[PDB]
Design a protein around this ligand. Structure first.
Ligand SMILES: Nc1nc2c(ncn2[C@@H]2O[C@H](COP(=O)(O)OP(=O)(O)NP(=O)(O)O)[C@@H](O)[C@H]2O)c(=O)[nH]1
Ligand SMILES: [Ca+2]
Ligand SMILES: [Ca+2]
Ligand SMILES: [Mg+2]
Ligand SMILES: [Mg+2]
Length: 166
């Protein structure tokens, strides 16, 4: 069966782990344990196709930035996550996109931009701002809440549908 190598990236605390765990294990992690690098695998059916999602949950802590080249080389598609209540995390997306672009030597890497924590009312990144950024990258923008599950499957499954247009 087809295997898809997804990599979840973004600044510390944006909810990369919560999103991945919600998708794979169907619960919300409330506590905050910073990630080094974890792997998850799951067989799912997406648009009639049985496939294997291999998901890499990466570090947002900048201390671990040296590990990025390795996982950007291997990954097929990237979920670029910021939090809608964290402007700096949105500004941090460009550094991720730029390094992906370098490592892949491509302006056409499968990616989805994800605005997470949409359940929180302390929004500092408006949907339109993020839509604009995604448009410049040629990729979709989707908002999610790992807490309520809103948009979680949509985000990861869309990343799969992007890998498929390539
Ligand atoms: N209200 C709300 N909280 C969230 C959401 N997603 C994650 N969180 C919370 O934000 C904190 C950090 O989440 P976490 O998934 O560990 O973030 P991370 O991006 O994986 N952090 P790191 O880069 O250090 O590994 C946790 O307390 C978690 O419960 C969300 O959609 N809504
Ligand atoms: Ca919990
Ligand atoms: Ca692009
Ligand atoms: Mg994490
Ligand atoms: Mg503003």
């Amino acid at each position: 069966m087809t295997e898809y190598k997804l990599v979840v990236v973004g600044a510390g605390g944006v909810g990369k782990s919560a999103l991945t765990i919600q998708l794979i294990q169907n619960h919300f992690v409330d506590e905050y344990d910073p990630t080094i690098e974890d792997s998850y695998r799951k067989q799912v059916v997406i648009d009639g196709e049985t496939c294997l999602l291999d998901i890499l949950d990466t570090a947002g802590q900048e201390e671990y930035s040296a590990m990025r080249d390795q996982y950007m080389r291997t990954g097929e598609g990237f979920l670029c996550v910021f939090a809608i209540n964290n402007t700096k995390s949105f500004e941090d997306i460009h550094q991720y996109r730029e390094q992906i672009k370098r490592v892949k030597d491509s302006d056409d890497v499968p990616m989805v931009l994800v605005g997470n924590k949409c359940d929180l009312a302390a929004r500092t990144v408006e949907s339109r701002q993020a839509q604009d950024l995604a448009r410049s990258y040629g990729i979709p923008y989707i908002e999610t809440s790992a807490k309520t599950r809103q948009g979680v499957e949509d985000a990861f499954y869309t990343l799969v549908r992007e890998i498929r247009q390539h």
